[PDB]
Design a protein around this nucleic acid. Structure first.
Lengths: 882, 76, 373, 156
DNA sequence: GGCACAGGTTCAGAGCAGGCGTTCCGTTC
DNA sequence: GAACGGAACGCCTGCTCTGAACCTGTGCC
């Protein structure tokens, strides 16, 4: 009943036609939370059933499909109702909250074969509400620690966040945990090492700011010595430390003098501190080769990244003394000796050809990524040091030239084999904050003191289309996973601030500079900087609405309600698409137009569906579809989808389906080979090229959505037995799309997916009519009826649709215009189905018409003709073949 | 203090009990004033079956509260 | 031996596989030093090819191993399985394992081996699922052994997401003429100490099997309860009786019939065990309005044969209480209560009639004749 | 009887294929002789019997003849064509029977029309699939069927 | 003339709905 | 009034929905 409630609510909110007819009844979700709210009066026979319902809902409908809309959206919503029922039961009934918490912990531990993300969200909510109650389950928690080497890293990393209010209180459990983690570092299973580093970094993080402080400053200095084990271990266990130390320093300041030392000695195994030896880093010690097994260990790029970030933090917030004044000279020597290294110092490009079969090619491919990362960190560092000094920007440009040299060397070596090397598309080591503050300074700095040094970077266009691409990579990385790579990379307020400050500059570069100002040619027309700023705008607009959904007020303030700001942001892309369409025909920009449509699509979802700005938006889109030719098919598909997504939230889109069917009929031809039709006046984006595989499938898909809404209405009406407006609406919808189906049945469609989707939607049409008739059976037996609406609809289905279906079937079968035998047999036994399924659906319509005609004393079968049937023959073509 | 006890035949009986007294004391009072045996008695308050070992203070029974008495005849 | 057993916490990552080779140099040198070297190679970091080699060197000599070595060996075998070598090593393991030639240290080391197997199947689905799928692929030969019952109970208890698949495999295995009484008797007579952990899982399987048709299945559902009451502790006995009263008071006609047959078999087998839990059997007298008169006859028979054993005349409380409830049932004007009173009176007089007992049956028959006049 | 007949393989001898095709031809001529008795015995139960068991015969013809026709077509083409033009002669009678059950609006008859109709259309499309897998797909013609009664007229 | 991206296709899996099997009440001569 | 046809509750088959990966076709270099 709860999942059917959620499918009701989603399908009811999806359309305006359904909201005009139905007045909203209470849903089963708000009933069950009312029950939990009303259980405070404390009849506690219920509460055990509420806990058992909550665990049933979280168990059955957890993300395991997600390791769509039909299987997705009413199965997140049932799982969130489960966790919401359990949390509300927990926050009311003080007796229960040892059997809820044990049952959650039983599912976090024994599982983690299956996803348990919903349970680790429930555990965090339970604990953060009342952290004292975990002292009731001190037995069960301490027997989860004994298994915190077999759980994966995600479980451990979040369970140990939850637990630690125990460990501030307790002392025996704390000294149990450290013992578990220290014995876990010496495991053989891979997850145990990274679980141990996650536990160590959390204990360093939140176990004092600086109990007694003298009992902390030594205790972290114990753990820190244990962490000098992990830096000796393999690459992933190192990399978790290099990414964690910045947060450790932020939340625990006084460990700084230790932590930097832990890094600095780690640097000294790979840095050769003698000048005039040209490769300043030891990359031949960062590769572990034994038994023809070649592995990266000690990712030096992330080490330099971590040293740079902690150094900048120490300079910024600590100072307002020997380790950092050394490290400045270390990084400066690394910079100055990295600039004048010409790839013969790392044995690259001529002694190596980067072949990923030989060990030497794999080693060179690893060291290539190493030197690229090192150059990226040094670009960020040289930008960091000076207030815009012209020497260090030339240094930045030379480092980028080395980076781009290695990048296009790997591009040349990736041009022979398949493009499976996604390790070249490995994330840049620029922090999101730096790429924000770099693009801002690149595109929006007019201060004359800075301008001479910035003109070194603005002159080189490759640097610009690197430093835009990197921000595109960052926002794409926020789309895929909910957090980005760098420092403050999981802290959503900082990600929101950097997305606002990326949007502000990308809009400026797209707006203030058009695409027609180019001097670049086709190679750079594929990747023009205006187009990349528009693409980043499309990814930002998309990725705000997933995550920063409450803040779409404040996100628009960065650039009066949501509708006015969204409309003003819409109008710029609207004018830009008009300027791109109306102006040129010759070789018009397909990509820019297509993702302008994508930007407008993402932006139109923020308008209120009854607003005047929504109405002018729908009117503009309809006028664009009514005017422009635009022979490119994907752009047409994107425009029509934008039009339908706008239209279905305003009113039922059956008249638009009818008009598009009439244009398809006019364009594609006719079955009989002599019927003269042309009705192009309706919609202009329909061609001989366009309409056949592209507008046909799209209009059929929208027909299916209309038929789904009508079938849901009929099924709801069959529940009750208020009525007459619902039946009049159903009959008007069905008559309109019956005319729609008529025009497509007569049409001379191609022999691909268009004919098959038509046949399947005709079965869906007839099934919907069969369900209407079978509903009228229930009513008309009681009183006497079939009013003139239903009789007229039956007459229309008999005259216009059905005999044309028969002639269309004969057209499909008569039309006849290298094969692996098993797949060929599978193909033909697939293709033998949809004509019989249409024949069955017609005959089962007529049979329920017979039933109705008998027990209503009105002969509805006098409208329809006698069923046409078909016989095959075989001709004398078999003598030619054999 | 005073409470009401309503049984299945609609008979309402007034009981003079203190919240410190246990539930079998209330069943003994029903045995004295109505003759119904305490093993057959079953007491319901606010949709909760009263246990024997508790008192009125465990179930938050205040002044003029209404109990429901049903007769649990094992076989008949 | 102490130097060997301490090697995982000493050595760093740069020196594993070297000591990987040289420990195997000591492995062929002595057969007295097989097991600490095997535990160390189970706990160190090794490449899978060498691990495959040493796994073959273990697996060829599996029959020449006394039970004391068998946990630390089999752990090593269940943490050397690859993603591709699952079914082969599981089938070879289930073939080669005897558990009979080894059989006070034996039972304890058997419990250690089953602890090891529970730890191996807990967190790696690739061994549990392949073990279940390697049992139904030996449905052909009727000669599978005690191990495949205990292992199905273990995987049914431990892993929750494979419960339905184990249930379906057990139904389609028992309908094939496979696992029957002669396996279950040997299982619950030998492996009673290992299964004594999983009382609740065994009774859940019995409850799930009693609900169906196909009297061969319901036979197994009865015999599971029977053997669980036979071998386990007093707490599991109490839980068995609770489950049986749950089947009687709730379930349908086949369920009530089967559970009453089981209670009759357990009171005729062990009255002294049922006398501790006789209040739970007394608890069926609340639900006489839900039970068919034939099952009323059977219920009164099992209760009244429980009450009238000679050594349990110190526990006369049930004997006076059911006399009370019979005289209460008979004293009703309603025919539906008088029917149950008459049935209980006659069956009670019959069981208690195998000089004062003659006067007792005299009084009982005279009172039922007086009220039934 | 006819559901128990199994189609062979191409590895099987041509003698077993020939005897199976003779066996099928016997069943089709018996089915035609059985169906043709409709016209002289028109009632509720005789029409009910042929409506149910007609589709149950055609489904057996679909599942356990058409693989044999797919196998043995390049060798025994004339037998296959003779079999199909024989099966058409009572398939037409079943179509007229479905029509007769619709026209006299008889509920107890009409409940078995849609699965029979679906099954005859499956038969047509399965013949097209046969010619597709035997590389004569452009020989499969079609054409409408005159609406006759049980005796044979043109009701219009 | 080859490589990369897109889109189709095909297979594998899983879950549930509808149709047939038993059992009883309505309807038609 | 009798007999034969319409009607409901449970279990099995298959069909469809969906995803994932492969592969093939087309366009640009």
């Amino acid at each position: 009943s709860v999942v059917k409630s959620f499918k009701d609510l989603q399908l009811l909110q999806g359309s305006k036609f359904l909201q005009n007819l139905v007045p909203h009844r209470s849903y089963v979700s708000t009933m069950i939370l009312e029950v939990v709210k009303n259980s405070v009066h404390s009849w506690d026979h219920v509460t055990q059933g509420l806990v058992e319902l909550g665990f049933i809902l979280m168990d059955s409908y957890g993300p395991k499909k997600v390791l769509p809309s039909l299987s997705r959206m009413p199965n997140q919503h049932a799982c969130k109702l489960g966790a919401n029922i359990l949390l509300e039961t927990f926050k009311i009934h003080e007796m229960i909250r040892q059997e809820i918490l044990e049952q959650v912990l039983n599912r976090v531990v024994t599982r983690a074969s299956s996803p348990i993300s919903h349970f680790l969200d429930l555990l965090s909510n339970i604990v953060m509400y009342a952290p004292l109650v975990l002292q009731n389950c001190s037995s069960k928690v301490t027997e989860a620690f004994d298994y915190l080497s077999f759980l994966p890293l995600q479980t451990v990393q979040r369970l140990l966040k939850a637990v630690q209010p125990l460990l501030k209180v307790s002392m025996s459990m704390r000294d149990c945990l450290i013992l578990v983690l220290r014995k876990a570092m010496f495991a053989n299973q891979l997850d145990a090492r990274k679980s141990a580093v996650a536990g160590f970094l959390l204990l360093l993080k939140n176990f004092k700011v600086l109990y007694n402080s003298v009992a902390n400053e030594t205790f972290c200095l114990e753990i820190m010595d244990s962490l000098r084990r992990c830096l000796s271990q393999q690459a992933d266990v190192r990399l978790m430390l290099y990414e964690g130390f910045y947060d450790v320093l932020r939340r625990n300041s006084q460990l700084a003098n230790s932590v930097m030392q832990t890094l600095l000695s780690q640097l000294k195994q790979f840095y050769e501190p003698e000048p005039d030896l040209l490769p300043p880093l030891k990359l031949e010690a960062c590769i572990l080769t034994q038994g023809d097994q070649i592995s990266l260990q000690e990712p030096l790029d992330y080490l330099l990244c971590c040293i740079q970030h902690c150094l900048a933090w120490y300079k910024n917030t600590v100072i307002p003394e020997a380790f950092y004044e050394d490290l400045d000279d270390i990084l400066e020597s690394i910079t100055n000796r990295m600039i004048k290294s010409e790839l013969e110092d790392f044995e690259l490009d001529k002694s190596a050809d980067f072949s990923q079969s030989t060990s030497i090619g794999i080693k060179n491919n690893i060291s290539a990524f190493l030197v690229m990362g090192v150059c990226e960190v040094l670009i960020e560092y040289n930008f960091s040091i000076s207030s815009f000094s012209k020497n260090r920007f030339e240094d930045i440009l030379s480092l980028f030239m080395c980076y781009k040299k290695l990048s296009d060397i790997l591009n040349e070596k990736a041009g022979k084999a398949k493009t499976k090397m996604a390790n070249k598309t490995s994330d840049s080591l620029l922090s999101m904050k730096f790429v924000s503050s770099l693009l801002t300074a690149l595109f929006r700095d007019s201060i004359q003191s800075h301008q001479e040094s910035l003109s070194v970077l603005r002159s080189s266009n490759e640097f610009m289309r690197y430093a835009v691409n990197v921000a595109l990579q960052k926002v794409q990385q926020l789309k895929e996973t909910g957090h980005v790579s760098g420092p403050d990379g999981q802290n959503p307020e900082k990600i929101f601030q950097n997305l606002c400050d990326l949007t502000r500059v990308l809009l400026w570069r797209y707006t203030s500079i058009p695409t027609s100002v180019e001097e670049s040619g086709k190679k750079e027309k594929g990747k023009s900087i205006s187009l990349l700023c528009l693409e980043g705008l499309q990814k930002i607009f998309s990725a705000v609405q997933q995550f920063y959904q409450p803040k779409i007020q404040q996100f628009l303030r960065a650039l009066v309600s949501v509708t006015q700001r969204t409309a003003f942001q819409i109008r710029q892309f609207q004018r830009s698409l008009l300027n791109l369409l109306s102006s040129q025909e010759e070789d018009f920009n397909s990509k820019e137009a297509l993702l302008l449509v994508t930007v407008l699509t993402s932006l139109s979802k923020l308008l209120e569906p009854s607003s005047p700005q929504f109405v002018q938006m729908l009117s503009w889109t309809s006028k664009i579809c009514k005017e422009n030719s635009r022979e490119d098919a994907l752009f047409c598909k994107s425009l029509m989808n934008l039009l339908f997504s706008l239209h279905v939230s305003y009113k039922s889109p059956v008249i638009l389906l009818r008009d598009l069917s009439q244009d398809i009929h006019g364009h594609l031809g006719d079955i009989d080979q002599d019927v003269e039709v042309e009705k192009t006046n309706h919609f202009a984006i329909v061609n001989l090229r366009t309409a056949a595989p592209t507008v046909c499938l799209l209009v059929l898909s929208q027909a299916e959505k209309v038929l789904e809404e009508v079938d849901w209405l009929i099924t709801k009406l069959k529940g009750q037995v208020p009525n007459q407006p619902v039946e009049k609406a159903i009959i008007m919808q069905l008559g309109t799309l019956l005319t729609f189906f008529h025009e497509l049945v007569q049409t001379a469609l191609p022999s691909g997916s268009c004919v098959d989707t038509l046949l399947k939607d005709l079965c869906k049409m007839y099934t919907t009519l069969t369900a209407l008739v079978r509903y009228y059976l229930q009513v008309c037996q009681s009183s006497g009826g079939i009013p003139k609406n239903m009789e007229k609809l039956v007459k229309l289905s008999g005259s216009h649709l059905t005999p044309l279906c028969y002639s269309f079937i004969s057209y499909v079968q008569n039309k006849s215009k290298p094969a692996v035998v098993a797949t060929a047999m599978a193909r033909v036994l697939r293709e033998t189905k949809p004509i019989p399924n249409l024949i069955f659906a017609i005959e089962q319509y007529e049979k329920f018409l017979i039933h109705l005609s008998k027990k209503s004393k009105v002969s509805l079968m006098q409208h329809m003709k006698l069923s046409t049937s078909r016989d095959f023959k075989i001709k004398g073509n078999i003598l030619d073949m054999v | 203090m005073q409470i009401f006890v309503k049984t299945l035949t609609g008979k309402t009986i007034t009981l003079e009990v203190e919240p410190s007294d246990t539930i079998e004391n209330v069943k003994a009072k029903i045995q004295d004033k109505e003759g119904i045996p305490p093993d057959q008695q079953r007491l319901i308050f606010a949709g909760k079956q009263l246990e024997d070992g508790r008192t009125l203070s465990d179930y938050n029974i205040q002044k003029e509260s209404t109990l429901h008495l049903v007769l649990r005849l094992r076989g008949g | 031996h102490d130097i060997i057993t301490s090697l995982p916490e000493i050595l760093g990552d740069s020196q594993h596989a070297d000591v990987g080779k040289e420990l195997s140099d000591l492995l062929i040198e002595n057969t007295s030093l097989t097991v600490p070297i095997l535990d160390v190679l189970s706990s160190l970091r090794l490449d899978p090819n060498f691990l495959l080699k040493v796994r073959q060197l273990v697996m060829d000599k599996l029959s020449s191993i006394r039970l004391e070595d068998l946990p630390v060996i089999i752990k090593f075998i269940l943490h050397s399985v690859t993603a591709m070598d699952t079914l082969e090593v599981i089938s070879e393991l289930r073939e080669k394992l005897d558990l009979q030639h080894c059989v006070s240290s034996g039972q304890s080391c058997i419990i250690l081996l089953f602890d090891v197997i529970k730890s191996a199947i807990r967190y790696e689905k690739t061994i549990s699922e392949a073990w279940i799928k390697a049992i139904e692929n030996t449905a052909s030969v009727s000669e599978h052994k005690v191990f495949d019952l205990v292992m199905l109970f273990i995987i049914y208890s431990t892993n929750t997401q494979t419960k339905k698949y184990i249930d379906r495999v057990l139904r389609n295995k028992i309908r094939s003429g496979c696992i029957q009484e002669q396996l279950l008797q040997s299982t619950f007579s030998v492996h009673y100490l290992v299964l004594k952990d999983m009382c609740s899982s065994i009774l859940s399987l019995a409850q799930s099997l009693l609900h169906s048709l196909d009297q061969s299945i319901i036979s197994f559902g009865s015999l599971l309860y029977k053997y669980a009451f036979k071998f386990f502790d007093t707490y599991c006995q109490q839980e068995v009786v609770g489950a049986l009263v749950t089947h009687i008071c709730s379930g349908n006609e086949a369920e009530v019939d089967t559970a009453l047959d089981v209670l009759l078999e357990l009171v005729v087998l062990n009255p002294s065990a049922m006398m501790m839990n006789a209040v739970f059997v007394k608890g069926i007298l609340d639900y006489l309005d839900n039970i068919s008169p034939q099952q009323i006859r059977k219920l009164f028979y099992v209760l009244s044969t429980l009450a009238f054993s000679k050594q349990n005349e110190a526990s006369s409380h049930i004997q006076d209480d059911m006399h009370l409830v019979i005289r209460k049932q008979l004293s009703s004007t309603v025919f539906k209560y008088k029917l149950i009173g008459i049935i209980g009176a006659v069956t009670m007089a019959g069981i208690m009639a195998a000089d004062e007992q003659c006067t007792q049956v005299t009084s009982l028959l005279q009172l039922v004749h007086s009220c039934s006049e | 009887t006819v559901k128990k007949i199994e189609p062979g393989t191409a590895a099987d001898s041509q003698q077993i294929h020939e005897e199976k095709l003779l066996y099928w031809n016997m069943a089709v001529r018996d089915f035609s002789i059985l169906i043709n008795l409709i016209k002289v015995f028109d009632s509720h139960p005789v029409l009910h019997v042929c409506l149910k068991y007609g589709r149950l015969f055609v489904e057996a013809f679909l599942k356990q003849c058409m693989p044999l026709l797919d196998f043995s077509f390049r060798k025994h083409r004339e037998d296959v064509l003779s079999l199909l033009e024989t099966f058409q002669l009572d398939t037409r009678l079943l179509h007229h029977l479905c029509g007769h059950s619709k026209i006299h609006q008889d509920t107890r008859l009409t409940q078995h029309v849609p699965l029979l109709k679906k099954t005859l259309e499956l038969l047509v499309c399965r013949v097209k699939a046969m010619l597709t897998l035997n590389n004569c797909r452009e020989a499969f013609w079609l054409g409408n069927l005159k609406n006759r009664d049980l005796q044979g007229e043109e009701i219009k």
